[PDB]
Design a protein around this ligand. Sequence first.
Ligand SMILES: Nc1ncnc2c1ncn2[C@@H]1O[C@H](CSCC[C@H](N)C(=O)O)[C@@H](O)[C@H]1O
Ligand SMILES: [Zn+2]
Length: 170
Amino acid sequence: PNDEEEEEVQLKSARRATSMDLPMPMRFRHLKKTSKEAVGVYRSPIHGRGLFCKRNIDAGEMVIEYAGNVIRSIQTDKREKYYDSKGIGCYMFRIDDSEVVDATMHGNAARFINHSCEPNCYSRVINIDGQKHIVIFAMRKIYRGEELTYDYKFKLPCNCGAKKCRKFLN
Ligand SMILES: Nc1ncnc2c1ncn2[C@@H]1O[C@H](CSCC[C@H](N)C(=O)O)[C@@H](O)[C@H]1O
Ligand SMILES: [Zn+2]
């Protein structure tokens, strides 16, 4: 039976590019589509709504982009004011002292990532084709059903599960 099979190509599960040891732009290229399969927003025991794993995520894998428009740091106060006056919930992520991502109007599911003192995700800024993106990566293998969390690293109380909880977000 294995006779015709002696020369056949052996097959196995394909590894996702988001999870492979490739240069960042190759990894980032299919992040949008892959992220939709990997994570979803559900109610969270930590706070309100959270981001959850729908399909196992590899350690070190690109999980999702913190999507939004890159804006100058000095446009930030005015936009917050404007969102306030309109009854819009503001979501922003600082890139550095000069730039932030504004996810308020053109954001995605990454806005719903809760804080935890014992996180399973971390963030990086990457430049792809001249454009800055904030990308969330998994610190460890993450399994279907687990909540994805990040350390905000900012008083106001902390609701994370952590045994080493810091008790306050800030
Ligand atoms: N560990 C934590 N403990 C208490 N509140 C938290 C928290 N992590 C996130 N939050 C809340 O969520 C906000 C970040 S936006 C994250 C999504 C949010 N849970 C939502 O339902 O829309 C924080 O300002 C804080 O209000
Ligand atoms: Zn905590």
